[PDB]
C-alpha cells in the first residue's frame, strides 16, 4: 500500500507494495 517508508534521498523500503 502506502506502507512505503522513505529513509533518505533516493532511499526506501517496502517499495512494493
Amino acid at each position, epitope marked *: *500500500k*502506502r*506502507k*512505503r*517508508i*522513505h*529513509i*533518505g*534521498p533516493g*532511499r526506501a*523500503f517496502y517499495t512494493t507494495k
Partner: antibody
Amino acid sequence: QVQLVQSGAEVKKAGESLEISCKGSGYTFTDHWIAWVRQVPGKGLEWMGMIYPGDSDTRYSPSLQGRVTMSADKTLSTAYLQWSRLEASDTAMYYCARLHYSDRSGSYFNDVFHMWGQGTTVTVSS
Amino acid sequence: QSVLTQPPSASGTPGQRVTISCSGNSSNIENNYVYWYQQLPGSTPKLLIFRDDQRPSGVPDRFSGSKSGTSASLAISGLRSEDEADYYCASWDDSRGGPDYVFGTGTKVTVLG
C-alpha cells in the same frame, strides 16, 4: 482529530504475562506503521520496533530478546505490546508513535513520527 | 555498534543560543534522514524537526536543524526557561536489510537561572 490513545498503568510481578494497547482513531488505522518506544526511569528513549496494521508485518529492534512482541487488530483499530513473562528490567514508560505527517500545504511524509500516545507506565517488582 | 552519541548536558544564559551535537555513522545519519525530539519533565516527546531541517507547523523558527557528514546539530535560539528539557536526535540505521529507528543518547538543556 487524529488520535493515539494508550491503555494505562500496570503494576506487576516478575514472571507474569502482560499486554498494553494503543488505539488510533479519526484516520484509516490500517494505513500507517505503529512503533513502540521504551524509557527506563531516569534513562533515555529506546526504539523497540514497529508493526504494520495493514498486514501485521513487524520489525523488531535487534536487542528485543524475543520475550516481547507486537500485534494489531484491524477490527478495533488497536496495536498491542505483548510479554509472555515479564522481568524486573521491563520496568519503564512505553509510548506508541505513528509513522506519518501532513503539513498544511497537503504534502505527505511517510517517515515522520509526528503523533504520539500519552505513554503507558509499567512497573515490575522482583 | 548502533549508537548516536550526544553530549550528556549543555547550557545557555537566557536569550542566548545553545547547540547540541549528534554523532553517528555511515550506516545511519550520513545518508539517512534525521529527526529531533524535545521531552519536558514528566511528558510525551514532541517532534521538533524532521528530514534534517524541516519543522512541523506549530514550531517556532528558533529551533533549527543542520547536518553535515557523519554528524548533526540542533540550534536553539532565543533561549527561554521553557526550553529547559531533554533533547534526543534520531535517524534510520540500515546495517541490516531494513529500516531500524535509533535515538541518540540524550542531552539535558538547562537555562541558567
